[PDB]
Write a protein that binds this DNA or RNA. Structure first.
Length: 71
RNA sequence: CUCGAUAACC
RNA sequence: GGUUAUCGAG
């Protein structure tokens, strides 16, 4: 519920462009499923897939992003 | 608010 | 033509 921003903030602290998000929507329009990939510093990071709304997609990808940034 | 579905029933 | 309910989206 808070990664999307931690990263946005990383973008500031390092001048970098604001995170581009990418939604893979797929399934019955009601049982829609989402996967996401952030592309910060033109670098792709994949969310764990099958989220039920867009945001939980983005968050998974942000939460992932930051996982590799601590490194 | 609008648009995209699905189940159900008359 | 409806209706009740249920979900996602800008």
């Amino acid at each position: 519920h808070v990664f999307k921003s931690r990263l946005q903030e990383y973008a500031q602290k390092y001048k970098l462009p604001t995170p581009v998000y990418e939604i893979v929507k797929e399934g019955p329009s009601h049982k829609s499923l989402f996967q996401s990939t952030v592309i910060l510093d033109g670098v792709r990071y994949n969310s764990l897939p099958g989220f039920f709304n867009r945001k939980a997609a983005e968050q998974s990808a942000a939460e992932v992003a930051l996982r590799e940034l601590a490194k």
